[PDB]
């Protein structure tokens, strides 16, 4: 019983820092991710270019292997350390059994490390929640999410960061059965998610794709302008 420390329970059976460390994620930048049937795609919002510096270093979407893709929320330093560890874990797994690394094993690694990191004596838990997207077994699209407690939790679409309830609520009203594939409709689905974002500034949108066989492709802020134009065309056709 108190917000210190991590080790003792509440008198009604809670952990304060486990519950409180998710708030740092919940005040963090928004990053969504869906799975198609063949091409999986995701993206972050709030690029927030401050007019005088470069932004190629602030990239919140990366990869550990050619088959898996990353995202996170919360603070950036824990994401840096966890991904730098996870690359070496992926490569050590590759040094073992010669398969491409399954998404399930590396999510069990990351959440397990995060949890046994939390259980120890006075280590501040990683206030992040990762998005781990891959299509490995005959191109079966999978995306799991993490938690500061360290619970991998398999979804079909995902939304975190600021206002994640509303952004996930849009996918409730959007995600019918016949999404994909239909890759173009998955493209427009990512575009409608970016239009349903908390700010949807139009130029602060950064999205990355994976066709389950190719590499990670960073798009261009003219294709997305065409996507916003055809989405506004669909809104006018609704009228």
């Amino acid at each position: 019983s108190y917000d210190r420390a991590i080790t003792v329970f509440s008198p009604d059976g809670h952990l304060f820092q486990v519950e409180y460390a998710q708030e740092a994620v919940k005040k963090g930048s928004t990053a969504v991710g869906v799975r198609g049937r063949d091409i999986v795609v995701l993206g972050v919002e709030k690029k927030s270019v401050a007019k005088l510096q470069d932004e190629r270093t602030v990239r919140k979407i990366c990869a550990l292997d050619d088959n898996v893709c990353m995202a996170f929320a919360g603070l950036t330093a824990d994401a840096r350390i966890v991904i730098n560890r996870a690359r070496v874990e992926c490569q050590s797994h590759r040094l073992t059994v010669e398969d491409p690394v399954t998404v399930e094993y590396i999510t069990r690694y990351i959440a397990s490390l995060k949890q046994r990191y939390t259980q120890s004596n006075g280590r501040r838990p990683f206030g992040i929640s990762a998005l781990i997207v891959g299509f490995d077994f005959d191109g079966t699209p999978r995306l799991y999410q993490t938690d500061p407690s360290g619970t991998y939790h398999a979804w079909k679409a995902n939304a975190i960061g600021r206002g994640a309830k509303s952004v996930r609520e849009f996918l409730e009203k959007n995600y019918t059965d016949e999404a994909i594939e239909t890759d173009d409709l998955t493209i427009k689905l990512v575009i409608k998610a970016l239009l349903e974002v908390v700010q949807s500034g139009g130029k602060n949108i950064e999205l990355a794709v994976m066709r389950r066989d190719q590499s990670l492709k960073i798009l261009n802020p003219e294709e997305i302008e065409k996507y916003v134009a055809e989405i506004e065309k669909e809104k006018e056709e609704n009228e």
Partner: protein
Amino acid sequence: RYDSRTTIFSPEGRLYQVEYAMEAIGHAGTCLGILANDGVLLAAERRNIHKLLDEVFFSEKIYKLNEDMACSVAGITSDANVLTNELRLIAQRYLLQYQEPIPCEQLVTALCDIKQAYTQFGGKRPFGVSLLYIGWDKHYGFQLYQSDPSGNYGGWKATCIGNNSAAAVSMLKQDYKEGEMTLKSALALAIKVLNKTMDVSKLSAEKVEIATLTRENGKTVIRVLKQKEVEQLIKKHEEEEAKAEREK
């Protein structure tokens, strides 16, 4: 209320010591580096300008770290020595392992991880020091970076130190330059920034410090320049002030 250690969180989730480390940063020396191709610069303000020193070190904030990189520094001064010896050791380990100069980004992330390991672990004092980066590589050319006690690092082209440099960043945005790689132009711009931002009346050269880094034919030399060109830079900038009062 929920103060005591660096670890664990305060319930927001916010932090205590990262914020207080930045507020430790703000009351320190002001430095800057500028947008320049074919070279890059560093500026620094002389703390403790009392007359009974020696200045036989030639360098008080600048540390020519590997061959082609220097670093300004700001904050608690002995922790800067602690980090700079280790950072030279990291760069020299990289050179030992590969026989190639370090391309500066993994160097920056390595130092950020060194700082971050003291952010998570407990109970240790995190380094209340931000510090700059100039350097050259085989992949991007001249570069600029901003280290932070959080472990976050920013690739800038016009950098930021604390309360004595928020107005400097405001002047850097309002007087932004792009396209001119002429180093004397950026040196005059930095002279203007330290003329307004420092409270030194008429900008005595003993209170300033300027170091540059140019690419010469294979060598990538670092120029800790002397005082007389600083003197004529001051006279040039004050002639530009006379040009400014031509509108009266």
